[PDB]
């Protein structure tokens, strides 16, 4: 939902 980008 937020910025979950590794």
């Amino acid at each position, epitope marked *: *939902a*937020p*910025d*979950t*980008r*590794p």
Partner: single-chain antibody, 225 residues
Framework: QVQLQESGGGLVQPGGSMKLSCVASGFTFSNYWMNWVRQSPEKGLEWVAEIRLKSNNYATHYAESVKGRFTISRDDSKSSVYLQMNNLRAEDTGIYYC????????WGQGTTVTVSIVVTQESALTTSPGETVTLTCRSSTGAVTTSNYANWVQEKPDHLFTGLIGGTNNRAPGVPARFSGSLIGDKAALTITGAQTEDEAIYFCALWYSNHWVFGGGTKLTVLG
């Protein structure tokens, strides 16, 4: 060393305008959402605004405290994020930080602006070297879940912020292994397994509610002996 560096703050009167900038290096800036967060004379952190990616047509979201007055933008070709502040108020006073990545790993040093849901953490805990201490983060809405993407951020002297944990339990790279995130008893928690003297610091949690962040009031950890 990823680096974020804010600029543009100063000493301004109520009613005025001012634009902050922040230049990023060391990570692929354009692949991450960026945020402004501000620290007021009261020591607390308040999330201000976010901006998404080019692929999200740069969608933005604001705290209710600044909606209608602040505009966040970014320029991927310059690895820079911005905050246009209009109709400044005394309550806008604070240190402004740009921060992002999984979800608050990286913080600038901040730029000072002087104008002239409740997330609850333990006010203070005391430990000593070698002990195991656990800090907790409660939501007024009910139980914390992985859908709140709990983050933990450490503030060292002087206004030195580093993200420890994002996505409930994901350690930011280079973060010592003694730090761990969890959900415990419907709260988010951060555990230091073997506290060290240098862990004396203020620890903030942040919880995500669909399209905004709310930071807790922080926990002062003392490490005695």
């Amino acid at each position: 060393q990823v680096q974020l560096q804010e600029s543009g703050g100063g000493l301004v009167q109520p009613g005025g305008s001012m634009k902050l900038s922040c230049v990023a290096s060391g990570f692929t800036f354009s692949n991450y959402w960026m945020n402004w967060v501000r620290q007021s004379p009261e020591k607390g952190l308040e999330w201000v605004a976010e901006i998404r990616l080019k692929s999200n047509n740069y969608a933005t979201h604001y705290a209710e405290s600044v909606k209608g007055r602040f505009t966040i933008s970014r320029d991927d070709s310059k690895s820079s994020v911005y905050l246009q502040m209009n109709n400044l108020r005394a309550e806008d006073t604070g240190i402004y930080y740009c921060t992002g990545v999984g979800q608050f790993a990286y913080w600038g040093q901040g730029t000072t602006v002087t104008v002239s849901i409740v997330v609850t953490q333990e006010s203070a805990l005391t430990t000593s070297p070698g002990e195991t201490v656990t800090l907790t983060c409660r939501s007024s809405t009910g139980a914390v879940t992985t859908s709140n993407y709990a983050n933990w951020v450490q503030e060292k002297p002087d206004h030195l912020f580093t993200g420890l944990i994002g996505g409930t339990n994901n350690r930011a790279p280079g973060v010592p292994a003694r730090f761990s995130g969890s959900l415990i008893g419907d709260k988010a928690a951060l555990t230091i397994t073997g506290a060290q003297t240098e862990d004396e610091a203020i620890y903030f949690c942040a919880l995500w509610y669909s399209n905004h962040w709310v930071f807790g009031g922080g926990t002062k950890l003392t490490v005695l002996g």
